[PDB]
Design an enzyme around this catalytic site. Structure first.
Site, PDB file in Angstrom:
ATOM      1  N   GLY A 151     -14.548  20.263  25.740  1.00 44.18           N
ATOM      2  CA  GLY A 151     -15.311  19.216  25.073  1.00 44.18           C
ATOM      3  C   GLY A 151     -16.691  18.746  26.004  1.00 44.18           C
ATOM      4  N   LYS A 188       0.848  -1.168  -0.035  1.00 41.14           N
ATOM      5  CA  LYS A 188      -0.039   0.034  -0.139  1.00 41.14           C
ATOM      6  C   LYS A 188       0.879   1.081   0.075  1.00 41.14           C
ATOM      7  CE  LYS A 188      -2.451  -3.120   2.294  1.00 41.14           C
ATOM      8  NZ  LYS A 188      -3.353  -3.989   1.719  1.00 41.14           N
TER       9      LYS A 188
HETATM   10 MN   LIG Z   1     -13.190  16.715  28.953  1.00 43.89          MN
END
Ligand SMILES: [Mn+2]
Ligand SMILES: Nc1ccn([C@H]2C[C@H](O)[C@@H](COP(=O)(O)OP(=O)(O)OP(=O)(O)O)O2)c(=O)n1
Ligand SMILES: [Mn+2]
Ligand code: NA
Ligand code: NA
Length: 327
Positions: free
Chosen positions: A181, A64
DNA sequence: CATTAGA
DNA sequence: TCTAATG
């Protein structure tokens, strides 16, 4: 770090694919070890044959590698990138609560889109329902500006419930970070440690508080030490409401806090680096403790910690502000 | 690497 | 119980 960039990236793509679409753990694991060594490889790879010289690089990957060096692309990659079915899994997977497993199942049933997900809310469990419901809000980063409003709320009740509680919003948030997040709050109490056989209410109470006032709006999972949920800032004098945020509250034996707290504060690199240092400095650091290293190979004996200081101290380092816990 | 769900 | 999913 870049001299091997594509090589690695193609490889990671490939890898990811075995693992999500198919269920070729091995191939999958094949790709990463490969992808991991070619990265350390200090020089520009000119052929497969060269790569090949590497450990982990079989005939499979070399090949590849050639096609890729040869032409700016990779067929199989090209083919996979295209394919609707595989495309679909990478996507369903986006839903909190959905993993490969369900993704494959859902797909094979004809659920490929968010819409389909809706039409069949019934095929989904509570966690996934919530995931679906808040899809949009789930992908949105957390502005520190908000992060600070939230933290302010949380610490506020905690205290109010029991003054003895010790809470710490950890993560990048802790680490300065402009956005984050989801919110990770560490929790500990004095009457809770290593030995002291639990006190589940300890976790529950607050969880209860947070809900009482509406900061917590949903529960992904509630156990007796970990609570996974959904929170939200009071939508002000209207015109503007707040996206639903992922939040994880965790109970900790007071005799493990700082390690814990240390740990989660990261950064992944600061960690390991700090961890690598404890080793020369004759120790060992892990999520919950730090034990003096005994010459016989290994050893034990949990050092007593009253702050993130104690730990630095121990290993005799420079107290690093979270801010600079960068690497 | 470990905790909660689920079925 | 296993097995999934998030951290
Ligand atoms: Mn976090
Ligand atoms: O160490 C673990 O915590 P997270 O997975 O939440 O990671 P961070 O806090 O570093 O990231 P962020 O808060 O930006 O999601
Ligand atoms: Mn988290
Ligand atoms: Na080899
Ligand atoms: Na998901």
């Amino acid at each position: 770090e870049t001299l091997n960039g594509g090589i690695t990236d193609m490889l990671t793509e490939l890898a990811n694919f075995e693992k999500n679409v198919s269920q070729a753990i091995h191939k999958y694991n094949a790709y990463r070890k490969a992808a991991s060594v070619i990265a350390k490889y200090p020089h520009k790879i000119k052929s497969g044959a060269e790569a090949k010289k590497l450990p982990g690089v079989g005939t499979k990957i070399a090949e590849k590698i050639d096609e890729f060096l040869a032409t700016g692309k990779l067929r199989k990659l090209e083919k996979i990138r295209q394919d609707d079915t595989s495309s679909s899994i990478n996507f369903l997977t986006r839903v909190s609560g959905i993993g490969p497993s369900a993704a494959r199942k859902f797909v094979d049933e004809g659920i490929k889109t968010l819409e389909d997900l809706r039409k069949n809310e019934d095929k989904l469990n509570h966690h996934q329902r919530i995931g679906l419901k808040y899809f949009g809000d789930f992908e949105k980063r957390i502005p520190r500006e908000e992060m600070l409003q939230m933290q302010d709320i949380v610490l506020n009740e905690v205290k109010k419930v029991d003054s003895e509680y010790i809470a710490t919003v950890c993560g990048s948030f802790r680490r300065g970070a402009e956005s984050s997040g989801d919110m990770d709050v560490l929790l500990t109490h004095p009457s809770f440690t290593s030995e002291s056989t639990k006190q589940p209410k300890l976790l529950h109470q607050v969880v209860e508080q947070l809900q009482k006032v509406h900061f917590i709006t949903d529960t992904l999972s509630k156990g007796e030490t970990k609570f996974m949920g959904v929170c939200q800032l009071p939508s002000k004098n209207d015109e503007k409401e707040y996206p639903h945020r992922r939040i994880d509250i965790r109970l900790i034996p007071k005799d493990q806090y700082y390690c814990g707290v240390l740990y989660f504060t990261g950064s992944d690199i600061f960690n390991k680096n700090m961890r690598a240092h404890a080793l020369e400095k004759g120790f060992t650091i892990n999520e919950y403790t730090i034990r003096p290293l005994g010459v016989t190979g290994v050893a034990g004996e949990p050092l007593p910690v009253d702050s993130e200081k104690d730990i630095f101290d121990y290993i005799q380092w420079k107290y690093r502000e979270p801010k600079d816990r960068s690497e």
